[PDB]
Write a protein that binds this ligand. Structure first.
Ligand SMILES: Nc1ncnc2c1ncn2[C@@H]1O[C@H](CSCC[C@H](N)C(=O)O)[C@@H](O)[C@H]1O
Ligand SMILES: Nc1ncnc2c1ncn2[C@@H]1O[C@H](CSCC[C@H](N)C(=O)O)[C@@H](O)[C@H]1O
Ligand SMILES: NCCN1CCC(Cc2ccccc2)CC1
Ligand SMILES: NCCN1CCC(Cc2ccccc2)CC1
Ligand SMILES: NCCN1CCC(Cc2ccccc2)CC1
Lengths: 334, 335
C-alpha cells in the first residue's frame, strides 16, 4: 500500500478490454464527447490538444476529426499500446502521438491549446482523476486554453429505492411459495442491505425519486483553488420537500458535465437516458417513513478516503422531519 | 492458513444476499422441498442432520415431512438467523440449530438421514462435499439416507452468443462512431478467452454445439469415495458438432438426484433446463475455433482441489477439435 503500488493497481484496472468496451458502448457518454468536441471545431482547427488519459485513444481521434493539427494521447495504463494501434490503423500516427505513463511526469515538446479528458468516476470524484487533469491544466495548457468538459455539477435527492423495497419484502413472501415463514428476517436483511457504510452504485428511475433534486456543488475547472478544495472536500448544504408517502431509504447523488458551445450537457440523472455511471446511493441505516411536505435537509462533503486517496468518501449529515439530525460516513464499494 | 481460510469461507454465508439468491432460486429450493417430501416414508418419525443449514429452510422441510428431530448444523454466523426462523415457525423442540463446523459439532446421537445443499459452482467448488462425507462417516447410521443421493457431471462444446457480440463489438465501432477499432479484436480475445479462469455464466440450448456428454457419476454412499476424490474426478468425452459455429470452448454443469418415494427427482443445472443460480461453468479456449457439422470434438477433464486452496476448484482439460493438434489448458475458479 505504498503510493506507487496503489497507483500501479489503479492503472492496471484500465489495462483490460472490459471497461473500455463499457465506456465506448455507453452511447450517451461517447456521443456527448464526440459532439462536444466537434462543435468546438472553431477553437480546435489547427490547434494542439492534450487528451488526459487517452485509454483506447477514441477521444484523441475525435479531436483530429474536429481539425486539430496535433494531439498528445497521454495514458498510464498498458492500454496505451492498444491506443497506439488504433491510431496507426486509422492512418493518424503523424497527428496523434501516444505517450506512455502518468500525465504528472510526461514530457510534451510544447504547451497545448486545449485539453480533453473523460475523468469522471462513480459519484463524479471516485478515482481522483480530476487532480491529474488539473495538474495538467496548470502545467501544459496555455493562457485562456480550452477545457473539455469545462465544468461539473453535483446533485442529491432522497429516494425510495423500489428494488431495495422488493428485496427487503422478499422474506415475507417465502411463506406462500414454500410454506415456511421467514418474515422475521426483515430486520437482518435491513442490517445487511442498509446498515453498512458503502456507497452503492445502482441505476434508478423517476419512480425512486422522492423530491426535487438539488444541486449541492459546482466545479468550475478553471477556478484557482480547485485542487486544494478537492483535497479538503467539496460539497454543500441542501434542502427539499417530499412529494408524498413513502419509505425513504436514503439519497442518490449524480453529476453532469458541460462542454462549451459552437452548450452541451452530459447528464447522469435518473430522469435522463441511462449511462454506465448510473447513480451513487447513500442508504440510511433503516427506512424512515415520510409524507407529502416532509422536510429533508442536510449537508454533504465528497473527499478522499484516509487510507486510499483515489477512493471516494462521503460525509453526510441529514434530518428527516421531526427526527433528530444524524450523521453517516460512507466509502466507495470495491 | 486453514482456520483462517475457513472463517473467511464461512463469512461468505453470513450476509443476506446469498441466502436470498439461493431461496429465490425456485428450481433449487422446490427440488429440495419436493425431494424431501417424496421421501416421507423414510423420514417419518426419524432423525436428520442438515449439513450447512444456513437460514434453516431445509431442516424445516424435513420437519414438515414428519422428521421426529432435525439437527441444523451451520458454521456461518447465519446460524443465528436459522434459530430466529425455527423459533418463529414454533419448532425449537424439534429442530435444533447447532453452531459450528459439522466436523467438530457434538450431536447427541447418530442420525437416520442427511440432507444437504453442498453444491458449488461447477458442482465441486467450495469443496463442501468433504464436509458432507465426513458427517456421513461419523454421524450417519448404517443403511441411512442421503439427500440428494447422487451427482453427475456433463460437458459440451459451446459458442457463447454473448461472447461472440463482445468480440464483434470492436468491428462495429466504425459504424456507431466513425472510428475503426476492428484491430482490437485480438486484444479483446486475449483478455476475454486467453485467461485461465473458470467463468460462471448462463447459456441457452442455442449456445450448445453437440450432444452433452456425462463425464463422471458420484454415488455418495460409495465407501471410499472420500479418498477416491482426493485425486480428482472426471474422464474422457467425445462428441460431434451440429453446424457451423465459432467454438469458444466448453460448458460444464451438474445434476443431483433424490431417491423416489413416487420416483427419482432430478435437479439439473443444464443450459437446456430452467435457469438456476449455478448457471454453468465455462472453460474457454484461448481463441475461437471455427467448427462445422460433424466436426469431432474430443478430450479429457479432471476437476480437482487447487494446490494452495482446497476449496478452490481446478479443472484440467485436454482437448482436440477436428484436425487441430491436441491442446491443454489448466483452469481455476474465478474470484
Ligand atoms: N494520471 C494519469 N495519466 C495518464 N492516464 C491516466 C491518469 N489517470 C488515469 N488515467 C487513465 O485515464 C483513463 C480514463 S477512462 C477514459 C479512457 C478514454 N479517454 C475513453 O474515453 O474511452 C484510463 O485509461 C486511465 O488509465
Ligand atoms: N463444514 C461445515 N459445517 C457446517 N456448515 C457448513 C460447512 N461448510 C459449509 N457450510 C455452510 O453450508 C451452507 C451451504 S448453502 C445451503 C444453505 C441452506 N441449507 C439452503 O438450502 O438455503 C452455507 O450456509 C455454509 O456456510
Ligand atoms: N473515466 C472513468 C469512467 N468510468 C470507468 C468505469 C467505472 C470504473 C471502473 C474502472 C475500471 C474497472 C472497472 C470499473 C466508472 C467510471
Ligand atoms: N451450496 C452453495 C450454493 N450456491 C451458493 C452461492 C454461490 C457461491 C457463493 C457463496 C457465497 C457468496 C457468493 C457466492 C453458488 C453456490
Ligand atoms: N478432504 C477430504 C476428502 N474430500 C472429499 C470430496 C472432494 C471434493 C472435490 C473433488 C474434486 C475437486 C474439488 C473438490 C475433495 C476431498
Amino acid at each position: 500500500r505504498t503510493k506507487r503500488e496503489r497507483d500501479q493497481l489503479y492503472y492496471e484496472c484500465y489495462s483490460d478490454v472490459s471497461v473500455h468496451e463499457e465506456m465506448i458502448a455507453d452511447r450517451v457518454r461517447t456521443d456527448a464527447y464526440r459532439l462536444g468536441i466537434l462543435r468546438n471545431w472553431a477553437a480546435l482547427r489547427g490547434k494542439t490538444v492534450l487528451d488526459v488519459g487517452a485509454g483506447t485513444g477514441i477521444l484523441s481521434i475525435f479531436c483530429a476529426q474536429a481539425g486539430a493539427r496535433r494531439v498528445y494521447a497521454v495514458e498510464a495504463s498498458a492500454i496505451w499500446q492498444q491506443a497506439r494501434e488504433v491510431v496507426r490503423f486509422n492512418g493518424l500516427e503523424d497527428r496523434v502521438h501516444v505517450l506512455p505513463g502518468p500525465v504528472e511526469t510526461v514530457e510534451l515538446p510544447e504547451q497545448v491549446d486545449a485539453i480533453v479528458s473523460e475523468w469522471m468516476g462513480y459519484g463524479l470524484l471516485h478515482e481522483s482523476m480530476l487532480s491529474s487533469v488539473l495538474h495538467a491544466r496548470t502545467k501544459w495548457l496555455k493562457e485562456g486554453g480550452l477545457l473539455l468538459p469545462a465544468s461539473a455539477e453535483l446533485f442529491i435527492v432522497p429516494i425510495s429505492d423500489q428494488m431495495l423495497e422488493w428485496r427487503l419484502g422478499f422474506w415475507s413472501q417465502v411463506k406462500q411459495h414454500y410454506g415456511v415463514d421467514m418474515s422475521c428476517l426483515e430486520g437482518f436483511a435491513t442490517r445487511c442491505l442498509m446498515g453498512h457504510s458503502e456507497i452503492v452504485v445502482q441505476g434508478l428511475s423517476g419512480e425512486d425519486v422522492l423530491a426535487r433534486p438539488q444541486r449541492f456543488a459546482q466545479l468550475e475547472l478553471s477556478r484557482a483553488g480547485l485542487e486544494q478544495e478537492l483535497e479538503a472536500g467539496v460539497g454543500g448544504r441542501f434542502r427539499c420537500s417530499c412529494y408524498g408517502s413513502a419509505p425513504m431509504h436514503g439519497f442518490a447523488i449524480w453529476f453532469q458535465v458541460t462542454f462549451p458551445g459552437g452548450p452541451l450537457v452530459l447528464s447522469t440523472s435518473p430522469f435522463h437516458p441511462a449511462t454506465h455511471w448510473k447513480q451513487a446511493l447513500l442508504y440510511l441505516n433503516e427506512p424512515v417513513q415520510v409524507e407529502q411536505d416532509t422536510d429533508v435537509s442536510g449537508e454533504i462533503t465528497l473527499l478522499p478516503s484516509r487510507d486510499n486517496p483515489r477512493r471516494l468518501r462521503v460525509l453526510l449529515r441529514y434530518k428527516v422531519g421531526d427526527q433528530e439530525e444524524k450523521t453517516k460516513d460512507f466509502a466507495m464499494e470495491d
